[PDB]
Amino acid sequence: GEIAKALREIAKALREKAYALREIAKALRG
Amino acid sequence: GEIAKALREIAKALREKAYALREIAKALRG
Amino acid sequence: GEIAKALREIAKALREKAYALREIAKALRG
Amino acid sequence: GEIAKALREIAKALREKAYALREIAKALRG
Amino acid sequence: GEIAKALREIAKALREKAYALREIAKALRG
Amino acid sequence: GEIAKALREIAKALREKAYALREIAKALRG
Amino acid sequence: GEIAKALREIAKALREKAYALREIAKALRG
């Protein structure tokens, strides 16, 4: 369904944010 | 549907937050 | 609908957060 | 509706987070 | 309703995040 | 309900983020 | 259901963000 697909798109965007947050942690360690 | 469209708008905003978080990571590397 | 309108209001708030995160990146570059 | 009202409450909390993120940017500029 | 109550629980968690973000700003100022 | 339960799981994950943000605040104060 | 499943996927992504935020705190302590 379109609603479930859009919710999965939200989850995908949140995973992109998680990736970026890990990059922030790595930048701080470096 | 309007609800699914709005959920996709939320996903797009979250992708722009991911953009900004990558920008923070780059600023910390520099 | 009121639900779709409220979801769009959430999207707008998330864009507001993205803008604020970009301000953080700008402060870190400076 | 109660669901729309709760969604608007979520949007309000997200705007509160945006304010705090701008406060972080201001602290970094200082 | 249980759905509205769960959405209000989400907003409550977001306000705790806002609190923490304000304390991050306070820490950076000091 | 399964939808309400999943929303409560989202709230719980947001509380975990709030926990982490408090840890960031305490790290900056230390 | 597909909607509840997608909401649980959102919660999973939020937990990934929480993990990353904890790693930011650890990097700041380090």
Query: Closest-CA residue in chain G for A5?
Result: G6
> Residue A1 has what DSSP assignment?
-
Q: Look at E7 and F7 and tell me if their CB atoms are within 8 Å.
A: yes
Q: Which residue of C has its CA nearest to D4?
A: C3
Chains E and B in direct contact, meaning 3 or more beta-carbon pairs closer than 8 angstroms: no
C-alpha to C-alpha distance for D23 and E23, rounded to whole angstroms: 10
Rounded-to-integer distance, Cα C2 and Cα D11, Å: 13
| Encoded tokens for F22 | 């408090």
CA atoms within 13 A on the CB side of E1: 13
What angle (nearest 5°) sits at the alpha carbon of residue D21, between those of residues A10 and E4? 45
Cite the beta strand spans of F1-30 per DSSP E. Answer: none
* Cβ–Cβ < 8 Å for A27, G20: no
Domain that holds residue F11: 1-30
Do E18 and D23 count as a contact with CB atoms less than 8 A apart? no
CB contact under 8 A, C18 and B23: no
Instruction: Name every residue whose Cβ is closer than 8 Å to that of residue G14 and which is 6 or more positions away in sequence.
Output: A14, F10, F13, F14, F16, F17
Place of tokens 């983020």: F17
CA–CA separation, B28 and A24 (whole Å):
7
Exposed (0-12), middle (13-18) or buried (19+): which is E30, by Cβ within 10 Å? exposed
Listed residue (B22, C4, G28, C26) closest to E24, CA to CA: G28
Question: What does the alpha-carbon distance between residue B22 and residue A21 come to, in Å, rounded to a whole number?
Answer: 8
Burial of B3 (0-12, 13-18, 19+ CB in 10 A): middle
Whole-number Cα distances in Å, C24 to B15, B30, C17, D21? 17, 14, 11, 8
- Number of structural domains in chain F: 1
E7, E8, E9, E29: best to mutate for the D interface, most D CBs within 10 A = E7
Hey, what amino acid is at A2? E
| Packed helices F2-29 and E2-29: angle between N→C axes, nearest 10 degrees | 10
User: Which amino acid makes up residue F4?
Assistant: A
Would you list the DSSP string of chain C?
-HHHHHHHHHHHHHHHHHHHHHHHHHHHH-
Contact residues on chain E for F2, CB-CB shorter than 8 A: none
> What residues of D are in contact with residue E22 (Cβ under 8 Å)?
20, 23
Other C-beta atoms lying within 10 Å of the C-beta of residue F5: 13
- Contact by Cβ (8 Å): C14, B10: yes
F3: closest CA among E4, D12, D1, C9?
E4
Minimum Cα–Cα distance from C16: chain D residue:
D18
- Asked if residues F17 and D17 have their Cβ atoms less than 8 Å apart, the reply is no
